Amino acid sequence: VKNSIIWFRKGLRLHDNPALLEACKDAKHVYPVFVLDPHFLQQKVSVNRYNFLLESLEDLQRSFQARGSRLLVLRGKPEEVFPRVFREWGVTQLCFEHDTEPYAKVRDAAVRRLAAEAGVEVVTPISHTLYDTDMLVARNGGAAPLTMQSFTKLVDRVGDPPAPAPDPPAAMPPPAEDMPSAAPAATGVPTWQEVGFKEPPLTVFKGGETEALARLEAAFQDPKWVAGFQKPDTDPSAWEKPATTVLSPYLKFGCLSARLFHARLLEVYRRHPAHSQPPVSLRGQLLWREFFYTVGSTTPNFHRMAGNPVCKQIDWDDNPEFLAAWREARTGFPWIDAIMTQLVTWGWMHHLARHSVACFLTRGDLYVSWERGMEVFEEHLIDQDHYLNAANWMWLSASAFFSQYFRVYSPVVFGKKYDPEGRFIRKFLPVLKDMPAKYIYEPWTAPLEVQRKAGCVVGRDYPAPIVDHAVASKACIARMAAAYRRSK
Ligand SMILES: Cc1cc2nc3c(=O)[nH]c(=O)nc-3n(C[C@H](O)[C@H](O)[C@H](O)COP(=O)(O)OP(=O)(O)OC[C@H]3O[C@@H](n4cnc5c(N)ncnc54)[C@H](O)[C@@H]3O)c2cc1C
Ligand SMILES: [Cl-]
């Protein structure tokens, strides 16, 4: 008799899940498993992202219950729980999606060793990325492309990515009954209060495959907008209706198939011959994701500076005071402080909004290491991706992929081009709601009578700017220029 385990780590969905389809094939009992460590906080992670994970697990639970099954949330470490459930459940096959992150390679190699001792077959298909990333490297002569131009030319030679896998059957083989490790009281999905958090999440994006597909269809309600999508032209100040899809948290956890996303993009492109082309198209944005996954997975110490063969060694300053003001959104620049407040409130900001805060902290004004601001992003971002977070921080700090350090965003003028009235600032910084638009981006320039009238006196209700952007940016550009000559 065949008894299988479908192990969820990423790929928290039922659609386009070849690991789930194999586990259900000729199976008498299937055990949907998610391994949860009950001591994760007692050792980092915000309640926004972690509750986003729990909502994604609750969505899988209701989907498995509608097919006669049930999701098992096991507590402990995979190295300690799986050797037990192999014998207890009589497992003959273990299936899970392939992951290329550093911790996953150490973890999955250990579990495969344990599965071989128990005589369990291991099937690990590829469906988190568009292509087999090792195949793309081998097709390129054994090395990953280091530019988007060459990378886009590589995938065009390989062809279309595999089509998404079909849906699982309407009825699944349920877990065996009266199994001690599958007791419902020990395998349920916990709430955010039970895992240890004390403050409630404030984000407006709900997790789960159902919400991911609902947001996918909403983006495709206007095929003209999908075909003519151009990433650099979108509005970072739009918050009532974000200018992009905001599918990043669902692609990070696997709530949405990247291959299903790509398949729907090609259907619209076929009926719109003037559609946008990479790297600015919507398909191009999925290729940025695939590109950073390909380079990051084959580069040692990608997430760091030292020992990173692609990251330039810059003598970033160790200034805890500048980092603290930037982290706590008290820089004195309302454009930056509002974006950082959106980071801690929603866990998601627009791409160009992330450019503004990352440039200001690194090569723009404060000259703080990109590793420090990234630890802040890894804490609060609900779409936090090990490879995408690191690769884009090296981009904005002019350490890798990007080298035009003479391009420095202004924390005053940038947002004013989109939102001259400062509506975005007034939403996330309510202390400036009564400030006139002439001074909403430069509140320290307002006369004292205006500050009093608006109920926002600089230095009392809102902090003064920590630096002079004209003075700070010139010093950073001179130091970046001296760093690019000492490389060679
Ligand atoms: C400093 C910095 C840190 C970032 N950290 C992350 C991160 O941890 N997780 C993350 O998903 N993205 C990250 N990005 C990329 C980008 O900010 C987001 O992917 C994007 O803002 C998400 O909104 P969206 O889903 O509407 O994007 P869309 O424009 O709708 O793009 C569609 C999808 O393509 C991918 N994508 C888009 N732009 C990029 C990009 N520049 N690089 C890689 N993939 C991209 C994402 O999966 C996204 O969901 C970072 C960018 C910067 C500048
Ligand atoms: Cl600018």
Residue 58's CATH number? 3.40.50.620
Residues shown for the chain: 488
Same domain, 231 and 291: yes
Q: Is the CB of 362 under 6 A from ligand 1?
A: no
Same domain, 13 and 154: no
- Tokens describing residue 339: 């974006």
- Tokens describing residue 166: 């079909």
Buried b / exposed e over 219-242, threshold 16 CB at 10 Å, is bbeeeeebbebebeebbbbbbeeb
Helix and strand numbers (H, E) in the chain are 21, 5
Same domain, 253 and 368: no
Same domain, 458 and 389: yes
Q: Is the CB of 310 under 6 A from ligand 1?
A: no
The number of the ligand 1 atom at minimal distance from the alpha carbon of 243 is 26
C-alpha span between 484 and 400 (Å, rounded):
12
Q: Is the CB of 303 under 6 A from ligand 1?
A: no
**Ligand closest in space to the Cα of 357:** 1
- Tokens describing residue 106: 């150490």
Q: Which runs of consecutive H residues, i.e. helices, occur in 307-380?
A: 320-327, 334-346, 351-359, 370-380
Same domain, 293 and 421: no
Whether 352 and 411 have beta carbons less than 8 Å apart is answered as no
Q: What is the Å distance from ligand 2's center to 410 Cα?
A: 4
Q: How many CB atoms lie within 10 A of CB 21?
A: 18
Closest to 264 in 3D by CA, of 282, 243, 287: 282
Q: What residues are neighbours of ligand 2 (ion), with CB under 5 Å?
A: 409-410, 414
Method: X-ray
- Tokens describing residue 85: 């459930």
User: Which domain range does residue 352 map to?
Assistant: 300-485
C-alpha span between 402 and 488 (Å, rounded):
16
Domain presence at residue 174 = no
Type of residue numbered 198:
K
Q: How many CB atoms lie within 10 A of CB 158?
A: 14
Q: Is the CB of 246 under 6 A from ligand 1?
A: yes
Q: 89 to each of 4, 174, 316, how far by Cα in Å?
A: 9, 12, 53
Domain presence at residue 193 = no
**Which residues neighbour 346 within 8 Å (Cβ) at sequence distance 6 or greater?**
48, 202, 203, 204, 205, 382
Whether 97 and 128 have beta carbons less than 8 Å apart is answered as yes
Same domain, 400 and 447: yes
C-alpha span between 403 and 363 (Å, rounded):
11
**At how many Å resolution was this determined?**
2.0
Phi, psi of 60 (to 5 degrees): -65, -35
Q: What is the Å distance from ligand 2's center to 473 Cα?
A: 12
CA 12 to chain centre: 14
DSSP SS3 for 351? helix
Q: Is the CB of 257 under 6 A from ligand 1?
A: no
Chosen domain end from 264, 299, 334? 299
Same domain, 359 and 416: yes
Number of independent structural domains in the chain: 3
Q: 230 to each of 145, 275, 354, 391, how far by Cα in Å?
A: 23, 10, 17, 21
Closest to 9 in 3D by CA, of 136, 132, 113, 127: 127
Same domain, 283 and 311: no
Same domain, 240 and 330: no
Beta bridge partners, 3, equal 29
Beta bridge partners, 29, equal 3
Residue bearing tokens 């094939």 = 25
The number of the ligand 1 atom at minimal distance from the alpha carbon of 292 is 43
Q: Is the CB of 258 under 6 A from ligand 1?
A: no
Same domain, 280 and 305: no
282-297 vs 148-158: helix crossing angle, rounded to 10: 100
C-alpha span between 406 and 35 (Å, rounded):
47
To test the pocket of ligand 1, the residue of 226, 292, 383 to mutate (highest count of ligand atoms within 8 Å of its CB) is 383
